[PDB]
Amino acid sequence: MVIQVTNKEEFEAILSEADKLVVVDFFATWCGPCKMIAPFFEELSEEYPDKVVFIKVDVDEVPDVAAKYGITSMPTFKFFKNGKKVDELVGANQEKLKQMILKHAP
Ligand SMILES: [Cl-]
Ligand SMILES: [Mg+2]
Ligand SMILES: [Mg+2]
Ligand code: NA
Ligand code: NA
Nearest-angstrom CA–CA distance, 105 and 47: 12
34 is annotated as an active-site residue: yes
75 is annotated as an active-site residue: no
C-alpha closest to that of 86 among 38, 13, 18: 18
Domains of the chain: 1-106 (3.40.30.10)
The catalytically annotated residue of 31, 57, 65, 101 is 31
Alpha helix ranges (H) inside the chain:
8-17, 32-47, 63-68, 94-104
The catalytically annotated residue of 22, 23, 34, 101 is 34
Which ligand is closest in space to the CA of residue 105?
Answer: 1
Determine the distance from the C-alpha atom of residue 44 to the mean position of all C-alpha atoms in its chain, rounded to a whole number. 11
Nearest-angstrom CA–CA distance, 86 and 21: 9
How far are the Cα atoms of 6, 35, 81 from residue 17, in angstroms, in the given order? 17, 29, 10
Nearest-angstrom CA–CA distance, 25 and 88: 10
Query: Under a CB-based contact definition with an 8 Å cutoff, are residues 62 and 7 in contact?
Result: yes
Nearest-angstrom CA–CA distance, 95 and 58: 23
Query: Under a CB-based contact definition with an 8 Å cutoff, are residues 63 and 26 in contact?
Result: no
Q: Which residues surround ligand 5, an ion (CB under 5 A)?
A: 1, 45, 53-54
